[PDB]
Amino acid sequence: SMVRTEPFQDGYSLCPGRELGRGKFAVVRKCIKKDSGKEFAAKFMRKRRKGQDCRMEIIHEIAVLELAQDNPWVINLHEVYETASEMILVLEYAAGGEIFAFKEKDVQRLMRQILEGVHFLHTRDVVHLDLKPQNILLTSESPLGDIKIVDFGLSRILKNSEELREIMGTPEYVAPEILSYDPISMATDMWSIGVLTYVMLTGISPFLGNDKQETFLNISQMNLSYSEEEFDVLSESAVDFIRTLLVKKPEDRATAEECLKHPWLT
Numbered sequence: 001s002m003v004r005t006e007p008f009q010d011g012y013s014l015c016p017g018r019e020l021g022r023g024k025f026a027v028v029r030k031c032i033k034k035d036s037g038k039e040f041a042a043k044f045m046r047k048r049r050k051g052q053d054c055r056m057e058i059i060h061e062i063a064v065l066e067l068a069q070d071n072p073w074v075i076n077l078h079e080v081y082e083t084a085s086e087m088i089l090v091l092e093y094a095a096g097g098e099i100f101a102f103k104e105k106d107v108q109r110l111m112r113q114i115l116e117g118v119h120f121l122h123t124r125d126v127v128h129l130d131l132k133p134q135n136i137l138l139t140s141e142s143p144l145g146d147i148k149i150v151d152f153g154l155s156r157i158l159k160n161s162e163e164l165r166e167i168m169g170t171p172e173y174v175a176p177e178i179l180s181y182d183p184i185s186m187a188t189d190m191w192s193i194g195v196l197t198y199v200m201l202t203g204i205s206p207f208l209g210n211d212k213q214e215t216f217l218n219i220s221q222m223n224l225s226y227s228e229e230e231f232d233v234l235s236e237s238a239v240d241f242i243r244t245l246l247v248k249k250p251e252d253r254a255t256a257e258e259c260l261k262h263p264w265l266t
């Protein structure tokens, strides 16, 4: 991006009222460009983090935003500002807010949009790695609008399996550990879309336990029975779709392109 060094407040007025989001190194505030009166989401990001220059982390976020700029299901980046301590990402404003039990038909329409966005990220070797309801926005609440994916803070651009074969090294030397390990991959995103699909259709988090250690155990060992009362109104195809995603072994999970061809969305 072309980084502007004139002051942000010269082109934009910050809206009053509750901020949009706040994290350890950044806050998002609704604003209005003085020219158009058009609304935007201004994301103020600190460069310094835990005492060290982390400008490169903001630069990484921008680069993922630009990679996905022709993706209509990812939030648009309008402008970038910079000051002595902050970089400001002027983002597209998604008037609906966060996605959040839905009706099965809404989930079908919205989930197809989400999968197109994710599919096109995977097409570009980007793994989002933080697909959750907080990060899936809507262009309208009533009626339900279109989805916008935000927040590429944990995102990575992943090496091909061929670079994973070279970083592997010669086979007779690899420890049993590495042969048992499952690295983060595109399939990691698809798991999360499985959890999201479950939650949208039923209202229950499938692996939530009484504490955290239980949630972790459920994630690694629980075979979901479905079969709770919330599934009676749901199609068999809806349960099958979830089952293609909540497969413990990552190699065996459906990809975004196969999800888009699944009969639940067709």
Ligand SMILES: O=C(NCc1ccccc1)c1ccc2cc1OCCOCCNc1ccn3ncc-2c3n1
Binding pocket: 020, 021, 022, 023, 024, 025, 026, 027, 028, 041, 043, 075, 091, 092, 093, 094, 095, 096, 097, 098, 134, 135, 137, 150, 151, 152, 153
């Ligand atoms: O980068 C974003 N989030 C990661 C993050 C935020 C702050 C600090 C560290 C990390 C992010 C960017 C833009 C927007 C929302 C984002 O996510 C918060 C979701 O809350 C939803 C809050 N309501 C709205 C309503 C309309 N809009 N239009 C754009 C946004 C936004 N949120």
